[PDB]
Design a protein around this ligand. Structure first.
Ligand SMILES: *[C@@H]1O[C@H](CO)[C@@H](O)[C@H](O)[C@H]1NC(C)=O
Ligand SMILES: *[C@@H]1O[C@H](CO)[C@@H](O)[C@H](O)[C@H]1NC(C)=O
Ligand SMILES: *[C@@H]1O[C@H](CO)[C@@H](O)[C@H](O)[C@H]1NC(C)=O
Ligand SMILES: *[C@@H]1O[C@H](CO)[C@@H](O)[C@H](O)[C@H]1NC(C)=O
Ligand SMILES: *[C@@H]1O[C@H](CO)[C@@H](O)[C@H](O)[C@H]1NC(C)=O
Ligand SMILES: *[C@@H]1O[C@H](CO)[C@@H](O)[C@H](O)[C@H]1NC(C)=O
Ligand SMILES: *[C@@H]1O[C@H](CO)[C@@H](O)[C@H](O)[C@H]1NC(C)=O
Ligand SMILES: *[C@@H]1O[C@H](CO)[C@@H](O)[C@H](O)[C@H]1NC(C)=O
Ligand SMILES: *[C@@H]1O[C@H](CO)[C@@H](O)[C@H](O)[C@H]1NC(C)=O
Ligand SMILES: *[C@@H]1O[C@H](CO)[C@@H](O)[C@H](O)[C@H]1NC(C)=O
Ligand SMILES: *[C@@H]1O[C@H](CO)[C@@H](O)[C@H](O)[C@H]1NC(C)=O
Lengths: 50, 425, 87, 197, 33
């Protein structure tokens, strides 16, 4: 997918690898190389009014 | 088994009448929704966001999202017009004079407080503090809340201008120019509008002022204690949430496909067989969004009907004195004061309620010299021995003279005629 | 509401023409260009209230106002054997 | 001016326009033409290719109908409001403020228009107002006199009684005011002499 | 039930029937199926 990846404060568990949301979408992930809780978030979007 | 009320047996006779001997100034409250939460969905991001393959396939399903966006824009414009047609009824913002002595009536609970940074009345503070993440977990999937045009400060200024015009001028600032008038005379006019004479107010001004102040003070306690008073507005805040969160829950449904994630379908299967798996999700999500829009249409229609009712009440109860029963309060409507609230308006109806009734002997007419004397404005009562004439809303016994009754024919065809002498000055 | 680029924010408040949101409203004013500003609710009037003064009108005017109200629409009918399945 | 009548002509037209635009869409099929699908494919697959189009067109028509229902409900509400105004503003003189025109309602005239009614509300707006010194009541010989129908005003030196909508100064006499109690409990009492014809 | 000469027997509830309805309400309920 696409989005912004930032450092998250979600206290994941050693066996937990992903993280869902209300709409069954992945909010946070774990980098397989270095153990770190990321945060998947799309960039800015909205409506263009002329 | 639920009770339908108490049991009252009003004694009905051909000769007795109940005349009220005192009165009460009751301030009731009425809550009316005006606007909703303007929401705007996204065409592609809700159906399939962060996916370039589905963005190309969604274009072959007609211009459904365009119609949905048009309907949402229409709903937003309608909710803005609903707020503009209720509070913005005057073209001149009035101001309260520095001296706040209006005869004895204390309006400190409804006038705006300049010390507070919100510039709202103490009642509006409780109204806004009792009507209350999910505002960021829904934005990332198209659900966007548009801010209203008229902010809370502008609605507060509109309500303050309406209150100033009602206190200083009365009902003259709604018809034409604002005509200044002392508040005791305005209250005397309000009393004359329902039948009570001006002397009843001018001789009991302190009692009426004390009753009005006590009712205004008890209104704050009633609104602060009971949490279900501001419910009709909270429902508008609740259902809208149920209209959004559920619309989010529809993104976790597979609609007969293998999964609810389009990335997992595009990565595993090839497009030739992923088309049929993506079409079910697209159709299901489009149908869910269409259902959301067609329900929000009915909700906006109901809210527009409520806003029209609130505007009619603002025009008939605040800008004047309506004689419609149970429209501007329960009883003899005296006046009304508007206040703002989150997506709603609160009308404080000041009403005249009779009390402490007493039983007297009545008669249709009297004749002194063989000619029936009918009351010009009032009713004939008796105290057991003498006959007096009093109005239909307050016991004020007066002698029967020639200027209080008119002659019409002889007293031979009327039923219930009693002989009594009249006075001639 | 968001980020508005293309119009300058003037401090004086005029009558709102093109509503934007959150009090901000745009218009096309004077070289002429598009400006944005906080909409004005009306004229700031102050009634000289007093315990003894009353405003009595000395003349009057008869004015005619117009109110337009819809009554009906265009009655439309559709058929199944032609709209969906063309011949 | 005639915009409210134009909108119901525009949206309805749009309600048809989009209803046609849904006929050129595939709804997930191979095309939007029936004969092309029946000629390029086999009857076994023709059903699975045409049922999607049938369902899409059925859903479009159902959406059109369920939107026209709400539109007809709005039009019915507006027509009920117009009928109430015709019965109250034209057939009589209603005292409802801001219902039969801005100001004191005098009369109303109905006019027809394409799918609409135009009410010309003839009203009464005061103007050229001026200030006066008012008083709740007056007492001549120890008995308060309250105005029967009007208001006591003053021009600086003399006191008159005028109606509440037009300045018509009249001499305060015994037939313009009524006596009710003494002038001891009223706030703002001013002494002044009354006339008796 | 002497109200001056007006007979409200057709609108007041009749205690004879067990339904405790007025003579007009009987026809109102017997015409809506
Ligand atoms: C009038 O009312 C009284 C009390 O109900 C009743 O006794 C009397 O009969 C009534 N009038 C006549 C003359 O019927
Ligand atoms: C009228 O009511 C008030 C408040 O209940 C009371 O103080 C006053 O004495 C009453 N006056 C009469 C006429 O009984
Ligand atoms: C009005 O009420 C306020 C409290 O909100 C009080 O401080 C003030 O003294 C009162 N004024 C009068 C006229 O009694
Ligand atoms: C009038 O008489 C009736 C008789 O039933 C009584 O119930 C009622 O309280 C009386 N009203 C007063 C307070 O005079
Ligand atoms: C009736 O009123 C007259 C005049 O006020 C009074 O003199 C008389 O005592 C009253 N009678 C009763 C029974 O109250
Ligand atoms: C009223 O007075 C007349 C003349 O005195 C008399 O004939 C008549 O009987 C009286 N009626 C009543 C109600 O006493
Ligand atoms: C109105 O009356 C109050 C109380 O007597 C007084 O404080 C105030 O100055 C008066 N204002 C005027 C003269 O309008
Ligand atoms: C009332 O207004 C009309 C029109 O302006 C004017 O001709 C007339 O003289 C005015 N009358 C008064 C009383 O000023
Ligand atoms: C007040 O009215 C009286 C009678 O019309 C008049 O004689 C007097 O001059 C007027 N005074 C002023 C100051 O207008
Ligand atoms: C009215 O007259 C009485 C008696 O002459 C006097 O005591 C009182 O002060 C006067 N009041 C005014 C308003 O001049
Ligand atoms: C009232 O009407 C009923 C029939 O409707 C009749 O039997 C009865 O006698 C009437 N009573 C009176 C007051 O005449």
């Amino acid at each position: 997918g696409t989005g912004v990846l930032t450092e998250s404060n979600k206290k994941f568990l050693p066996f937990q690898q992903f993280g869902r949301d209300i709409a069954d979408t992945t909010d946070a992930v774990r980098d397989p190389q270095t153990l770190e809780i990321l945060d998947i978030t799309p960039c800015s979007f909205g409506g263009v009014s002329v | 088994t639920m009770s339908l009320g108490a049991e009252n047996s009003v004694a009905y006779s051909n000769n007795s009448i109940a005349i009220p001997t005192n009165f009460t100034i009751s301030v009731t409250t009425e809550i009316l929704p005006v606007s909703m939460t303007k929401t705007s969905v996204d065409c592609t991001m809700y159906i399939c966001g962060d996916s370039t393959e589905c963005s190309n396939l969604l274009l072959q399903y007609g211009s459904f999202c365009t119609q949905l966006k048009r309907a949402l824009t229409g709903i937003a414009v309608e909710q803005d017009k609903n707020t503009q047609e209720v509070f913005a009824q005057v073209k001149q913002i009035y101001k309260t004079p520095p001296i706040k002595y209006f005869g004895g009536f204390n309006f400190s609970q409804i006038l705006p407080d300049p010390s507070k940074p919100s510039k709202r009345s103490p009642i509006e503070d409780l109204l806004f503090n009792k009507v209350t993440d999910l505002i960021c977990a829904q934005k990332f999937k198209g659900l966007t809340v548009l801010p209203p045009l008229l902010t809370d400060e502008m609605i507060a200024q509109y309500t303050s201008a309406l209150l100033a015009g009602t206190i200083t001028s009365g009902w003259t600032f709604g018809a034409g120019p604002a005509l200044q008038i002392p508040f005791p005379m305005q209250m005397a006019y309000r009393f004359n509008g329902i039948g009570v004479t001006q002397n009843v107010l001018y001789e009991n001004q302190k009692l009426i002022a004390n009753q009005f102040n006590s009712a205004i003070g008890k209104i704050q306690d009633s609104l602060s204690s009971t949490p279900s008073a501001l419910g009709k507005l909270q429902d508008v805040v609740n259902h809208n949430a149920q209209a959004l969160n559920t619309l989010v829950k529809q993104l976790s449904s597979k609609f007969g496909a293998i999964s609810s994630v389009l990335n997992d379908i595009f990565s595993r299967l090839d497009p030739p067989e992923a088309e049929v798996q993506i079409d079910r999700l697209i159709t299901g999500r489009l149908q869910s969004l269409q259902t959301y829009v067609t329900q929000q249409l009915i909700r906006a229609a109901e809210i527009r009907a409520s806003a029209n009712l609130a505007a009619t009440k603002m025009s008939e109860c605040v800008l004047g004195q309506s004689k419609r029963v149970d429209f501007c309060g329960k009883g003899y409507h005296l006046m009304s004061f508007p206040q703002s609230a989150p997506h709603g308006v609160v009308f404080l109806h000041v009403t005249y309620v009779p009390a402490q009734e007493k039983n007297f002997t009545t008669a249709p007419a009297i004749c002194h010299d063989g000619k029936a004397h009918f009351p010009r404005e009032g009713v004939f009562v008796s105290n057991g021995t003498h006959w007096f004439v009093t109005q239909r809303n307050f016991y004020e016994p007066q002698i029967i003279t020639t200027d209080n009754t008119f002659v019409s024919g002889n007293c031979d065809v009327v039923i219930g005629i009693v002989n009594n002498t009249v006075y001639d000055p | 509401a968001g980020c508005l680029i293309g119009a300058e924010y003037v401090n004086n408040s005029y009558e709102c023409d093109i509503p934007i949101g959150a009090g901000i409203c745009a218009s096309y004013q004077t070289s002429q260009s598009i400006i944005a500003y906080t909409m004005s609710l009306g004229a700031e009037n102050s009634v000289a209230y007093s315990n003894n003064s009353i405003a009595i009108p000395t003349n009057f005017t008869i004015s005619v106002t117009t109110e337009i109200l819809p009554v009906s629409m265009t009655k439309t009918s559709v058929d199944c054997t032609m709209y969906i399945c063309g011949d």
